Curated annotation (Swiss-Prot):
Tissues of expression: Expressed in the brain, where it is localized principally in the ependymal cell layer, choroid plexus and the area postrema. Also found in spinal cord and in the eye.
Residues of the full protein shown: 1113 to 2470 of 3034
Main subcellular location of this protein, as a coarse class: membrane
The species this protein was found in: Mus musculus (Mouse)
Stated name of the protein: Cadherin EGF LAG seven-pass G-type receptor 1
Residue span(s) of domain GAIN-B: 1196-1319
Tree of life domain: Eukaryota
Lineage: Eukaryota, Metazoa, Chordata, Craniata, Vertebrata
Length: 1319
């Protein structure tokens, strides 16, 4: 017995006018298998195939494509197949799909490699999954995906595949494909999501061929894919697929912002003055920013704040715009961390393992980055950016050893820049960083920079710092390196950053990044790029970042320090600076008198009785600046060194019992040698683990502001502190080693801080003890050189040397003339930067490096920055443009009419005007006395004529004038004049110089156009019953006609007759065809061609033609008959051909074809303007209503019906003025007018035919052309079978007015024909 699995066939046909890639012969067989090896199975089709789409071998089951399949048309169909062994029968389904490939398709196409998945599961049943995962990632429908190639990518033996495909841009606008870079970025971002949804190991993207930079100058290298060859069908068990082989190549394009034959020159976009008077323009690579002034906002600062009103997008992040009653508006921010007046986010905090992802940088040569940060870690990452491969170009900025460092590589070498700031920057206070990168140009021999040089310069600045003086001669000035610079040279000309922007720490990828650190903790704010400030809320990714900075809250609020306590805010807390003799959090303790120590004072306690117990507290209060020395040495037990020093400006605390070192703990996390007051407390605490008792050594610095708890491990406990010493190192109580210097306050000892067991200063140790703490003023000597302000800092000072001076020597920089280009250095009495650079004319800027080349070059205009004129030369405009305004002026000989956007030549008559140039707009020549007309072409006397001497009254016929191009010659009365058709036309134009009105309106019926000369010759033979017409000739004639009819031109009477005859012949032939013999099945655009030709033919400008044309043929009548018969055949064969529903819109024609499910159709409005997204003019907003009972029966094939509706806009007034002669049926009003577009709706039901007369009427909703309401409508239909006019006519029988509002008129009709409302 057998079995078969439902299967599909995919034919990817790359149709071109050059290659007949259509395969022939055997392509495959039914995927039929049977364990029995003796039976001869019978292969027959049951249903589906009706027009022989596929040729089947009944015996072998071989499948062959039929010849009718060769066209540029996608298709889908479902076939039923039966297999029989002679005793049992099974059925199966096969879905056939044909997809067309174009050149625009192969241009926008990308390839993505997959690991461990060869041609065994990607051409079996999982391809659907991929074409979905891709849809979900792209947020698009599965139809937009078009996978056209899947070939074995086993370069050598590796399990890797190679799928190349393309995508359609969502939006409904046909013809748009995703740019390659857009696809690349969109695939790269949601990679893990795709991995999860599609269950596969997606491989990363590899480097491109442009790595070697083979292109020249400022160009751009892009890899592209073109057609190479076609392969036969690859067979599986479920799918027979035909692949198409591409081949790679390169292409160089000029990026914007550059000009020249090699784009070697750059353009400042601010020359166009976009900000206007309400702002100032900042240039940037390929763009500009506005510092647009106060009370003005908007992308072009086109919106006023105080006097404006609500506008879309001004209230960001969902802010509700409320219009103030007196003008202006307010953006109500939603409750959250949003900043007025625009509800933005600027400050963020970063806990461990949290990072954000923004958009990457795309600037090629020059850029600037700046931000502000605050943290405490010695080593941490700040910023990184690179490529997908994590190689070649990359940049990164970090903090190492409390010093900023920038490391970057342009693909060749790594370079580090390290400005030095005294005291570090890891103090928890906010700091700002600025970085600039730019490339020097190749200065040409003529002084013109020809392309970019090989020198790349990076500059780093930290906080307030002068860059020029630093970089040049900071060392010569003294110690001043707050800024730094690095330089690179190499063959590469540009810096490429493919990857996105990250912040706060790299994602924990297995690939190591070229970075010293790996993470970061802390707060940042104001990430400004090129002046523009980025909103923190507008992030692309977020792996744990939380908005705001909680540690920087003003904690002094709501807190009241005690007597003398001054509140200050500190990291995550506050601190009350207490006066002397007061302390304890909020100054809640009294301490004994402080003592001043100068390297010789040491105190000690002994002769004490203490037993090992729990707990114990040792508290001290200190302030100093020494970076070493013993603050407290306590020999617990035998020789248990409790070494509490300030080693290397950090509180170190060793505990070493006996001859062994046991434990230690340091406070390197905080430098405490600042000289400020600090309290510390040793805590000996218990901890019962199981049965044993351990201890714990918690020192709390500043009442637990800091706290470190060394686990006192089993060796350490049981050893209480026996001897206590503070002051330094001493053993013979005479010589002092490492004596302490500074100021210290009272001492706490015992189980609790409240255990005030005063040790009697008078008792114990009294050696070198100086009462008090006051110190002689170091600034009394006043040692800084002049221009100084000495400031005592508690046993230290520093020259706050006067402004305008720099470095340790505090020297004026203006003396060392940093101003460039021989510019004078003038030091104003008050200068924010201390000095100024006075410069001569022709140079502007802070250092006046910039220079203006006025006058600007030819075609270049702008002050003080030149810019292109951008004049439209093709429209007769002079290329030269206003050197101030920038307005383009037309070339001489021309004048631009007010209603026309192109200046046309004046074409004045030399004998009629004193001058020759005609006035602007009006185009009036310098008319001499006696002559009138816009071109001075008419004497006042209808009998006087123009000669060199003026308007002389000639006697004998129209003269020799130039009116209307024709030098219409002398002619008598009654006699016409036939002269050769005007220039560009052939035939014989005739005019009659009538005795009454002179020249009659010329009869151009004979005049034929050059475009129709071949067409006229081709028409002549056709009506002679000679040559015979065929489908291919039909297609070629349709295409030629559409081309000759496109554009705007005065179609002629012989031309309109020819067009009518040709359309009639074509439609008559098309009505005679059936099945695949219809030209419809071979072409896709024939519908568009015919509808466009029809719309062009019915142009209103031919009314004067039409009234003539109308006395010759029926015209619109037989044309409409041809149309309806054609569409009837289309409806009869649509299901056979499987044509997809479609709507065609032209300025005067609407065509809609749609397919409904019979069993589920519940009425609808047609054409589906709800489903129509194209911009619809308000007049065209009519409708046709099918009620829900349309399909419902009046009170397996035949499940789908079709509906086609055609709307003719102006056809009604185009029709001959013919009305029903029966006065009884039609009472003719005084001025009846067809006021509605003609609608032809046709519903076709497969199977049992519906009655010819619609047993259930259809609804139609029209609009009106003119809006006057002075009379009444009648819903009529223009019959064709009616004897009125032979071609039928308007009649009210069977249709009447149901409803009428001020904008719509709804009538009902029981016929599927042409109907309209005679309003
Ligand atoms: C990665 O995948 C996510 C989906 O998991 C993509 O998010 C989608 O992004 C678009 C564009 O921002 C969103 O469309 C817009 O949504 C907003 C809010 O509803 C709406 O106001 C706009 O009119 C528009 O519809 C879309 O909602 C969002 N999510 C979904 C369900 O698709 C994301 O684009 C992908 N790319 C990245 C960032 O890696
Ligand atoms: C395979 O199936 C077809 C379709 O049933 C068979 O065609 C029939 O042939 C017999 C004569 O042998 C006619 O009497 C029938 O009317 C035919 N049926 C149709 C609808 O065509 C064909 O004979 C079968 N072949 C085998 C292998 O038995
Ligand atoms: C986002 O951050 C989290 C941590 O908050 C990351 O999770 C860790 O990732 C590493 C590397 O895979 C693992 O070794 C850890 O076990 C993970 N959790 C812990 C406990 O840190 C996560 O990987 C980051 N981003 C993503 C989604 O990759
Ligand atoms: C970072 O951005 C903020 C934006 O708020 C700046 O704060 C403003 O600074 C200006 C100029 O001093 C003041 O007029 C505003 O009132 C400030 N707004 C407030 C209250 O935040 C801030 O100066 C920028 N710089 C840094 C490094 O913080
Ligand atoms: C492709 O390579 C894989 C390697 O596993 C192999 O199994 C498969 O049969 C190959 N297909 C063709 C047609 O080369
Ligand atoms: C300046 O820097 C040098 C580096 O060797 C250092 O020796 C000197 O003490 C510094 N001077 C000061 C105090 O700024
Ligand atoms: C530019 O236009 C202004 C305003 O019409 C005019 O004053 C100025 O002379 C023009 N400059 C030239 C000569 O193009
Ligand atoms: C062509 O033949 C038809 C049918 O006899 C006739 O009506 C028509 O006038 C003929 N056309 C010419 C002018 O050859
Ligand atoms: C369309 O007609 C014009 C005028 O004869 C001709 O120049 C042009 O090449 C034609 N284009 C096509 C598509 O045939
Ligand atoms: C025809 O006229 C329209 C008017 O909108 C115009 O847009 C179009 O460019 C014209 N085409 C020509 C020049 O034939």
């Amino acid at each position: 017995p057998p079995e078969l699995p439902d299967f599909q066939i995919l034919f990817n046909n790359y149709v071109t006018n050059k290659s007949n890639s259509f395969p022939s012969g055997v392509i495959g067989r039914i995927p039929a298998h049977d364990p029995d090896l003796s039976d001869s199975l019978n292969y027959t089709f049951l249903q589906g195939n009706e027009l022989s789409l596929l040729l089947l071998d009944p015996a072998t089951g071989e499948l062959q494509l039929s010849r009718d399949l060769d066209n540029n048309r996608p298709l889908e169909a479902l076939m039923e197949v039966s297999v029989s062994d002679g005793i049992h029968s099974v059925t199966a389904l096969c879905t056939l799909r044909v997809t067309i490939i174009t050149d625009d398709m192969l241009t926008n196409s990308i390839t993505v490699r997959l690991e461990n998945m060869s041609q065994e599961k990607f051409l079996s049943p999982l391809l659907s999954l991929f074409v979905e995962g891709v849809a979900t990632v792209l947020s698009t429908t599965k139809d937009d995906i078009f996978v056209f190639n899947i070939q074995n990518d086993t370069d050598v033996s590796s399990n890797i595949l190679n799928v190349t495909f393309s995508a359609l841009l969502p939006g409904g606008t046909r013809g748009r494909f995703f740019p390659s870079e857009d696809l690349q970025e969109q695939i790269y971002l949601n990679r893990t999501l795709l991995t999860t949804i599609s269950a596969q190991r997606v491989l990363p993207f590899d480097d491109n061929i442009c790595l070697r930079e083979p292109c020249e100058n400022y160009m751009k290298c892009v890899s592209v894919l073109r057609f190479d060859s076609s392969a036969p069908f690859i067979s599986s068990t479920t799918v027979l697929f035909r692949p198409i082989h591409p081949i790679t190549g390169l292409r160089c394009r000029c990026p914007p912002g550059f000009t020249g034959d090699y784009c070697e020159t750059e353009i400042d976009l601010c020359y166009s003055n976009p900000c206007g008077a309400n702002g100032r323009c900042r240039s940037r690579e390929g763009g500009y920013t506005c510092e647009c002034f106060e009370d003005f906002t908007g992308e072009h600062c086109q919106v006023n704040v105080r006097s404006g009103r609500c506008a879309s997008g001004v209230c960001k992040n969902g802010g509700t715009c409320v219009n103030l009653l007196i003008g202006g508006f307010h953006c109500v921010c939603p409750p959250g961390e949003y900043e007025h007046p625009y509800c933005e986010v600027s400050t963020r905090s970063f806990p461990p393992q949290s990072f954000v992802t923004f958009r990457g940088l795309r600037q090629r040569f020059h850029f600037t980055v700046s931000l502000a940060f605050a943290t405490q870690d010695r080593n941490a990452l700040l910023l990184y950016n690179g490529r997908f491969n994590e190689k070649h170009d990359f940049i990164a900025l970090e903090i190492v050893e409390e010093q900023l460092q920038l490391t970057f590589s342009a693909g060749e070498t790594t370079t580090t820049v390290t400005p030095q700031v005294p005291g570090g920057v890891s103090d928890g206070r906010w700091h700002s960083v600025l970085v600039q990168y730019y490339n020097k140009p190749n200065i040409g021999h003529l002084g013109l920079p020809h392309g970019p040089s090989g020198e790349k310069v990076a500059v780093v600045t930290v906080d307030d710092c002068d860059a020029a003086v630093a970089v040049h001669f900071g060392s010569y000035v003294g110690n001043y390196s707050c800024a730094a610079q690095g330089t690179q040279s190499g063959s590469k000309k540009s810096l490429d950053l493919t990857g996105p922007l990250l912040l706060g720490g790299v994602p924990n990828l297995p690939e190591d990044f070229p970075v010293h650190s790996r993470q970061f903790v802390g707060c940042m704010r104001n990430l400004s790029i090129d002046g523009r400030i980025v909103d923190m809320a507008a992030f692309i990714a977020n792996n744990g970042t939380r908005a705001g900075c909680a540690s920087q809250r003003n904690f002094c609020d709501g807190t009241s320090c005690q007597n003398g306590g001054t509140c200050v805010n500190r990291w995550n807390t506050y601190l009350c600076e207490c006066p002397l003799r007061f302390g304890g959090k909020n100054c809640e303790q009294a301490m004994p008198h402080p003592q001043r120590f100068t390297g010789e004072s040491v105190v000690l306690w002994s002769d004490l009785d203490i037993t090992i117990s729990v707990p114990w507290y040792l508290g001290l209060m200190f302030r100093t600046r020494k970076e070493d020395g013993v603050l407290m040495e306590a020999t617990a037990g035998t020789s248990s060194r409790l070494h509490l020093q300030i080693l290397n400006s950090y509180i170190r605390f060793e505990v070493s019992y006996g001859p062994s070192d046991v434990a230690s703990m340091q406070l390197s996390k905080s430098r405490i040698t600042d000289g400020g007051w600090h309290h510390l407390l040793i805590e000996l605490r218990s901890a019962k683990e199981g049965k044993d008792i351990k201890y714990l050594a918690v020192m709390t610095l500043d009442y637990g502001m800091d706290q470190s708890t060394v686990q006192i491990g089993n060796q350490l406990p049981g050893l209480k502190m026996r001897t206590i010493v503070i002051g330094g190192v001493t053993e013979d109580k005479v010589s002092v080693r490492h004596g302490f210097r500074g100021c210290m306050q009272g001492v706490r000892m015992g189980e609790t801080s409240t255990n005030i067991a005063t040790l009697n200063m008078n008792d114990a140790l009294k050696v070198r003890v100086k009462d008090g703490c006051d110190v002689e003023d170091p600034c009394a000597s006043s040692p800084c050189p002049p221009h100084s302000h000495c400031r005592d800092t508690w046993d230290s000072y520093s020259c706050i040397c006067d402004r305008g001076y720099f470095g340790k020597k505090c020297v004026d920089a203006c003396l060392l003339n940093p101003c460039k280009h021989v510019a004078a250095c003038v030091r104003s009495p008050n200068t924010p930067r201390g000095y100024s650079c006075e410069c001569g004319p022709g140079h502007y800027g802070q250092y006046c490096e910039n220079k203006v080349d006025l006058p600007c070059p030819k075609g270049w205009w702008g002050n003080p920055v030149c810019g292109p004129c951008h004049c439209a030369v093709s429209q007769g405009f002079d290329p030269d443009c206003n050197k101030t305004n920038g307005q383009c002026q037309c070339k001489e000989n021309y004048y631009k009419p007010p209603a026309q956007d192109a200046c046309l030549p004046c074409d004045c008559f030399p004998h009629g005007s004193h001058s020759r140039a005609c006035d602007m707009d009006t185009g009036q020549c310098a008319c001499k006395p006696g002559v009138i007309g816009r071109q001075c072409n008419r004497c006042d006397n209808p009998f006087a004529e123009v000669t060199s001497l003026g308007c002389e009254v000639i006697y004998n016929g129209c003269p020799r004038a130039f009116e209307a191009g024709i030098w219409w010659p002398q002619t008598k009365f009654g006699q016409p004049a036939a002269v050769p058709c005007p220039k560009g036309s052939v035939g014989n134009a005739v005019r009659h110089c009538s005795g009454e009105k002179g020249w009659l309106p010329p009869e151009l019926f004979n005049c034929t156009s050059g475009s129709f000369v071949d067409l006229k010759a081709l028409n002549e033979k056709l009506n002679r019953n000679e040559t015979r017409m065929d489908g291919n000739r039909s297609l070629r004639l349709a295409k030629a006609l559409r081309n000759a009819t496109q554009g705007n031109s005065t179609l002629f009477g012989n031309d309109v007759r020819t067009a009518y005859q040709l359309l009639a012949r074509i439609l008559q032939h098309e009505s005679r065809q059936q099945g695949f013999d219809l030209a419809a099945t071979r072409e896709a655009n024939f519908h568009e061609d015919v509808v466009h030709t029809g719309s062009a033919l019915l142009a209103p400008a031919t009314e004067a033609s039409w009234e003539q044309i109308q006395r010759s043929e029926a015209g619109a009548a037989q044309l409409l008959r041809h149309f309806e018969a054609y569409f009837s055949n289309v409806a009869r064969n649509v299901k056979r051909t499987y044509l997809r529903p479609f709507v065609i819109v032209t300025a005067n024609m609407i065509l809609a074809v749609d397919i409904f499910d019979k069993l589920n159709f519940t009425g609808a409005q047609v054409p589906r303007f709800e489903d129509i997204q194209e911009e619809l003019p308000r007049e065209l907003e009519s409708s046709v209503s099918f009620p829900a009972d349309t399909f419902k029966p009046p009170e397996e094939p035949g499940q789908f019906a079709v509906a086609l509706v055609v709307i003719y806009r102006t056809l009604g007034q185009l029709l001959p003025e013919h009305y029903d002669p029966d006065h009884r049926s039609l009472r003719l009003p005084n001025r009846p007018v067809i006021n509605t577009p003609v609608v032809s709706a046709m519903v076709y039901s497969e199977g049992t035919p519906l009655p010819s007369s619609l047993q259930r009427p259809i609804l139609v909703e029209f609009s009106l052309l003119e809006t006057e309401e002075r009379s009444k409508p009648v819903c009529v239909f223009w019959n064709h079978s009616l004897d009125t006019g032979g071609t039928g006519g308007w009649s009210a029988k069977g249709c009447e007015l149901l409803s009428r509002n001020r904008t719509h008129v709804t009538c009902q009709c029981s016929h599927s024909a042409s109907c309209a409302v005679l309003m």
